[PDB]
Ligand binder design. Sequence first.
Ligand SMILES: NC(=O)c1ccc[n+]([C@@H]2O[C@H](COP(=O)([O-])OP(=O)(O)OC[C@H]3O[C@@H](n4cnc5c(N)ncnc54)[C@H](OP(=O)(O)O)[C@@H]3O)[C@@H](O)[C@H]2O)c1
Length: 318
Amino acid sequence: SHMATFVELSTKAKMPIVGLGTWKSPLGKVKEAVKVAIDAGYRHIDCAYVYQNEHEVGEAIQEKIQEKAVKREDLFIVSKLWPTFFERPLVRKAFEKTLKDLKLSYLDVYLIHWPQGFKSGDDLFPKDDKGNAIGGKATFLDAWEAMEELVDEGLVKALGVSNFSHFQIEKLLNKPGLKYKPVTNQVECHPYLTQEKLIQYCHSKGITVTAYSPLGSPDRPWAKPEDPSLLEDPKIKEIAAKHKKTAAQVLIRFHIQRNVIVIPKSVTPARIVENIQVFDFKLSDEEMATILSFNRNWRACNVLQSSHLEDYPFDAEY
Ligand SMILES: NC(=O)c1ccc[n+]([C@@H]2O[C@H](COP(=O)([O-])OP(=O)(O)OC[C@H]3O[C@@H](n4cnc5c(N)ncnc54)[C@H](OP(=O)(O)O)[C@@H]3O)[C@@H](O)[C@H]2O)c1
């Protein structure tokens, strides 16, 4: 029986500092992964419309609620709005699909998944004849307006953003008539991409950070063998040995000690349990400084080529 520390959001809601990632968790494996996580004591599950598995997540959650293994109010369910759905009627239709698949009556956090709006229609990844991403009509500020309505209606408890630079968050925080502030910014982060300035900025604004791909996303389709590999880094494994822990557990604990929420994905029952066993050790200040020194400014998750649309987040220094 495990419990992740709570990080307090600006709304006073309590967000578990470790959650289960579900990107690439296949149909036919994700349902069990979520059951196992809930049995182990995970309460935060990270989800998205684009992962196309929310209905199996919804099945797992419903079954554990019926079983009385957990109550809804102790779960913390996060989903995201995909940028082909920024137009107002579409915000509400995409949201309703996620909430239906997940079989819930409310979400704990709903995120803008990426800051650039894309052409609406059937394709999730609309591209021109040359394969460049096609921009849409509505901006992330337009979508945010429609998302605030969901909070007014009691269907989402808090809103947040993902893949935002500080410039894009400034634009949001400065929007005229802003009703709700983002409670987290979910971005890639790990010892090869330490995000020092973006974390400093977010915290200074009362915005949490959620670290995605904290293990280096080894299962990402575009991985190349010469790409840095955190889980095989010998200096990470050495610090791990010193604490009698795995590299993955050190990689998860790194974020916990910076007060950054972290969402490792697994569909392997043993690794699910291993990844939440991270509250029985502490990395020394020396060890934190060493791990922080590994920054390479390297992004594993840098596939959208959309740097020719406005609001490309990764051109900014942070
Ligand atoms: N907002 C965004 O744009 C965005 C982008 C990327 C990710 N995310 C979210 O962040 C979550 C985590 O990132 P990610 O899926 O990219 O990658 P990740 O969590 O860095 O790595 C997942 C990979 O590591 C393996 N793994 C898990 N625990 C392990 C352990 N203890 N030892 C060894 N290997 C282990 C998993 O294998 P098995 O599954 O086979 O065990 C899987 O191949 C995602 O699933 C998603 O929910 C969000």
